[model samples]
Target: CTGCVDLDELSFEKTVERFPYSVVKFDIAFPYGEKHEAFTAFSKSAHKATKDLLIATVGVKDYGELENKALGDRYKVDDKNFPSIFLFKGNADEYVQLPSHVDVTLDNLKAFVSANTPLYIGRDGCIKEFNEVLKNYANIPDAEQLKLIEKLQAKQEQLTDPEQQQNARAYLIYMRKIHEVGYDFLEEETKRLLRLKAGKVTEAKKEELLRKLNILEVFRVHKVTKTA
Candidate 1:
C-alpha cells in the first residue's frame, strides 16, 4: 500500500522527478507464486524497451483471498487476473495502489499503464514521447530556451508541406501500432513464462493459449509428450 491516496507518506518521488512527463504504475501479484523467468524477464524487457518513454515498477506478494477477491471488475474491473497495474499521474499529489490476488506479470502491468495512462492524458504516445525527451534532455541551457525553440521549429519545418505532415502523422501512427504489436507479443510470452515457471510441464501448453493472445505462431505447441 505504498502509493495509495491516503498513503502519501509512501509516495514514490523518484518516478515523479525522473520521469515527470510520465506517471507511476505499481504492480503486485496474487494467487500463484513468482513465475520469475517469464514474469521478471517480461518486466525487465518492458522497462528496457520503453525506458525513454515511461517509468514502471513491479512487486509480487501472496494473499489468501486473492482468487475470488481479485478477479473480475470488482474495483471497476481493472483486470487483476492479468496483472494489477495501477497508475497515477506524475503531477498528481497522491499515489496509486494495486488490488490484491492473481499472479501478476510485470510486463502486462506496464503495458496496461503505458497504453492507458497518458503523459498529458488524451494525447498520443508519439507526441508525449517526443516532447518529453525534448524537455528532459540536459545540457540545453535555460538561456538557450529560445534557441531550442528555434531549432525545434526548424526541425518541424522540415515536414512543412501537407505531404510531409501526412508522412509524419503516418510515422507516429506506425509507432503506436508497433508498440501495440510488441505488447501483444510480450503478453503471450508472459503466459508462456508462467507455464514454464510452473514446472509441471516443460513442454508448451498450446491448448491453453487464448487464440487472440497467441504470439510468435511458430511455437504452435505441435504436440505434447505426456510421457515425462
Candidate 2:
C-alpha cells in the first residue's frame, strides 16, 4: 500500500477519527488488479507530498467470521466493490465517494482529491508552487503580473534539472498567454480542448491533449468541478 496505512475495524476509527481530511480506501484482504496497484502507487506519492493528509486503507477480510466486513458495510461498500475511495473531511459522519464511472487513473484521482480538498497534487510536468501562485493571478495588478513573470524567469535560471526547466518554461508561456488575453483564455482553451477530445485522436495524441488539459487546470482560479 506504499505509505497508505492498513486499517481494520479496530485501527480504522482510532487513526482516522480526528483527521480533518483523509483519503481512505476500502478493499479486500487479498486485493489484486490494476485499480489496487494504481491506488497503492498514488498513496506513496500523496503520503510524502502532503503531511496533513491521511492516506490509508481498510481491508475487509472474509477469511474469519467475516472480519472487517461490518466495518466495510459501515462505509456502505460491498465486497465486490473492492478498492473504493472515499474522502472524509471535517470529521463528518458522511464521506464523499468518488463516482463509480470515473476512470481510476492517477491524474483523475489526483484531481478529485485536489478539487474538493485544500490539498494540491502536482503532476509530472506541472509546477505545484506556480499553481498556488496562479490562484491569485486574477487579483494582481497588471504590472505586478509582469513583475512576477520576470521573477519566474530568474527562478527558472536556477533550475538546472531538465524537467524543471521545461516546466518553468511551460508556466512562463501560460502566464504570458493569460496576461495577453485575460483569464477567459482558460475557459476558451479548455473548451477547445474538450471539443478535440470529443473527436477521434490517436492514443499518443490523446495523452498529449490530456497533459495540456491538466496543465490548464493548474491555472484555474477555482476548481472546474467539485464533489458533492
Candidate 3:
C-alpha cells in the first residue's frame, strides 16, 4: 500500500488529489504478479533516488470495467502495450505517457521526466541573466543604460559564430521586450524577429515600428553597414 498503491475508482482520484506531481505506472495484473513486481521495483527505485519525486502504480484487475471502459478508453492506452508509465502534473486533467521504447530504469525515468516537464524558474538561464543585468545596472540614467546596452552589444558583436551572435541578440531583445511589452509578449516578440528574418510581410511592418527604437535600431544600422 505504501510503496506502490494499486489505484481503484475512488482511491485513484484521492491519490491524484494528494500527490499532485506523481509518476504512476500502470499494468493489467493481479497483486504482486510479474507485472506488479516490475512496477514495485520501479517505484522503489524512484523513491530511493529522489525525495523530490512521488511514485505510485495502478494494476487493472477488472479488464472490462476499470481497465477497458475507464482508463484504457479515457487515456487512449494501447492494449498492445499492457504496461506503461504515466506522468501527471499538478492538477492537470490529462497525463503524459512515457514512450514504449524507454527503459523502465530509475535513471531513464528521471531523464524522461526532466525532458517532458519545465524546470523551476530558479533554474531558467535567460531570466537569471536578465535579473543579474538589472541588478548590475540598478537606478541608471537613460545614458548609462544606453552605455550598458552598447557594452553588451559590443560583446555580442565580438562573437564570431552567427548562431551565438543570434542567441546574444535574442537575450538583448528579450530584455527590451520585458521592459516594453511585459513577460507575456516576450515569446511573441522573439517569433516576430524570426518572421522578420524570414521576410514575412506581417512581421515586416512591426519591424519598421520597432526599428525606429533604440538598441535594435542601432544594431540593425551596424548590421547593414558591416555587410555593405
Candidate 4:
C-alpha cells in the first residue's frame, strides 16, 4: 500500500483528528446504508471531539492562528502540494516545516484524551457555540443527574463487546442533538406567544393571520388519509 499508516497498526488512532484524511471528502463516496449511517454518526462525534480537543490544547489566539492559517498566508499551495499542516517557528517562513516531532506537537493532543475524547470536545466556545447553534437545549436536572448516570450504566449491561462503548458514545451524542432541537421547538412556541400577546388575535378571529405566521413554520408534518 502507498499509505504511510497501516490500518491495523493505527488501531489505537481512533480519533479522526489523528487520521490523515478530510472527512468531508470521505463522506461523499461513503455507502448509503445502515453501516454508512453508523460511520457518519461516529465521524460527527469524533469531529466534536477534535474541535473540543483543539480548544483546550491551544489557547484562542493560537487556535485562531491555525484556523485562519491559509495556504498563501505562510506557505503557498502548489500543484505538487498535498494537504498537510505546518507549524512555523516564530511565525516565520524561514523555518516553516511539517511539525518535526509528533509527540512535541500532535501526540500531546492525543494524550489528553482516551476513547471518550469525543464527548469532551476541546474549547469552551466550541462546546457552547455548537450547543447554541446545533444543540441548544440539552439540559440535565441536578436532582436527576445521578439517576441519569445510573440509567446510562444500565444500558451497558446488555453489551459484552468492546464496540459497545463506541456505540454508546454515538447514541449519547445523538440524544444530545435531539434534546437541543427539542428546546429549539419550545423557543419557537414562545415567539408565537409573544406575537399573540401583541395583538388581540384569537383562533376564531385570526384565521388568515394563522396562515401568514404558518408560512414561516419550519416544522415537518406527516399527512395521513383514511382509505376504504
Candidate 5:
C-alpha cells in the first residue's frame, strides 16, 4: 500500500511525469464498494511487487484538497463510472481504461497491467520474471529452446523464498511437460481443467483448479488464446 500513492492533482501530475507507465484507479472520496476493495488489494500486492511502474488511486472530493474532482473530471470520469481504472503510459498524456468487462480481480488487474506494458505482473501461481522468459520461448529457435529451458532452472535457484521456489518448481514442471509432449499442453490442459471446475466447485477443488488455470495461462498467454 505504501507504494500505491494516493494522489491529488499535484501528485497525479507528477505521476504522469515520473513513471513510464502507471495503473491508476479513480473513485469517489473514501469509496466503499467491492470494486474499491479489489483495487485496494491489488494496489497493496503490486506495491513491492514492482519498481517497473507505479500503482495509484485518486479520491475526488467536492471540497478542498479532496477536490481532486478536477483530476477525475478532466479525464472525463464521472459518477456513472464512479470506480474506474486506467493504464496510463506516462508523459505522453495518453491512456486506456481497464475494460468494462471483467471484474477487477487481482489476476485480471495483473493481466491488465501486463498486457499494456512490457512489465510482467504475474498473478497467483505465476512468477513475474519467469513469465517474460516464457514469452521468449516461443520466439527462439527450437534448437536453443532446450538451452533456455535449462536456464529457467537456474532462475529458480536464485529465489530465496520458500513459496516462490515452489512456484518456480511448478513452472519447471509445465515447461518440461510442454517440451516433452508439445506446446498444446497449455491449451488442452486449460480446456480440460476448465471443464472440471465448471459448476459447484468446492473451495478445495476451486483452489486446485484455479491454480492450474493460472499456471496454464502463463504459457497460453503467449499465443493470443481468446476469452473463456
Candidate 6:
C-alpha cells in the first residue's frame, strides 16, 4: 500500500533520506476526516503518476504536535491551513509550497512535480537534449540554437524514441517556417502524405493531394497506395 509517515523530527529526516528526490511533505491532521481522506487518496495517485521521480508523504500532526522538536513551532498547523503541501528537494534551504490556486488533484500534482523533475529516467539521450533546447529556445543564443538544431538534424535518424524523432524533425520544420532555414518542400509534402496515410484517407483523396503537391510521379514510383 502507498502510505506516508506520521512525522516528527527524527522520522522526517529518515524519510527524506530514503526518497532523496522531491519529497512531497503534506502537513495534515486527524480524526482522519474528508481532507485526511483526500490526502490519503492523493498520495496513492501521486505515486502512480510520478513513478519514482517524486515521493509523497503526510505529516499527520495536530496543532500541538506542530510544536515538537522537528517542527519547532515556526511551522504552524491549523484548520484553515492544516493540509498544506510542501515539496522538499534534498538539502535545499527552502521547500516549495504547492501553489494555492492549483487544486489538490491527481493530474495537477503530477504536472507540478514533473515540471520540477527531469525527463523520465532512461529516456535521456540526444533527442531528450534536443527537446530541452526547444523548451529553452527563447533563452538560447541564436548562433547556439542553430548549432544545436543542425546537430539534432544530423542525429534525428539515430533517435530511438519515435516521439523524440518526430520532435527533432519538427524543430527543423519550425526553423523553416521562421526563415531561419531554407525551404524543404519535398520533406513537407512527404509529411503531409504520411499524415494522410495515418488518417486513412481515400486513395482518390491521396492522389488528389499528391497532384496538388506535384509529387504524383514520385508517389507513383514509390507505390504510395501500397506504402506500409
Where is model 4 more than 4 Å wrong at Cα?
1-45, 48-50, 53-73, 87-166, 169-228
Estimated TM-score for each candidate: 0.28, 0.57, 0.43, 0.19, 0.63, 0.43
The Cα error of candidate 2 at residue 112, in Å, is 2.1
- Candidate 2's residue-wise lDDT over 1-228, tens digit each? 388788777777777767778888788886778887788778865753566788777778878888889888887888777678888884637679998888676777788898998887666566666666676575467788899899888888998656567667867887888778777778888889899998989987886677677777777765323211
lDDT of 4 by residue, 125-215 (tens): 1222223322212344333434543565566566564544444443344444334454354356548645875798766546443432332
Clashing pairs in 6: none
- After aligning candidate 5 to the native by TM-score, how far in Å is the CA of 9 from where it should be? 3.2
| Model 6 C-alpha lDDT per residue in residues 44-132, reported as the tens digit of each score | 54543334444545455555745332452434444466556666666334567776677665556556665766524322112335444
lDDT of 5 by residue, 52-122 (tens): 68788888786675488778888888867867888888762888888767788877888888788887655
lDDT scores in order = 0.38, 0.76, 0.54, 0.33, 0.74, 0.50
Q: In model 3, what lDDT does residue 70 have?
A: 67
Lowest summed lDDT window (length 10), candidate 5: 219-228
Count of clashing pairs, candidate 2: 0
Candidate 4 steric clashes: 3
Instruction: Return the lDDT, model 1, position 44.
Output: 40
Q: RMSD of each candidate?
A: 18.2, 7.6, 15.2, 19.3, 6.4, 13.0
- Candidate 1 lDDT for residue 92: 38
Best model per lDDT: 2
What is candidate 3's TM-score against the reference? 0.43
Q: Could you tell me the lDDT of residue 187 within candidate 6? A: 62
Ranking 1 against 6 by lDDT, winner: 6
Question: How well is each residue in 120-165 modelled by candidate 3, as lDDT tens digits?
Answer: 2221122233334554232334466666677677777677744345
Residue range 75-178, candidate 1, lDDT tens digits: 23433434444454554344454445534555455555556555222121123223443432222334444454455445555754453343334333322332
Report the CA-based lDDT of candidate 4 relative to the real structure.
0.33
Model 3 steric clash pairs: none
Residue clash pairs of candidate 4: 52-121, 52-122, 53-122
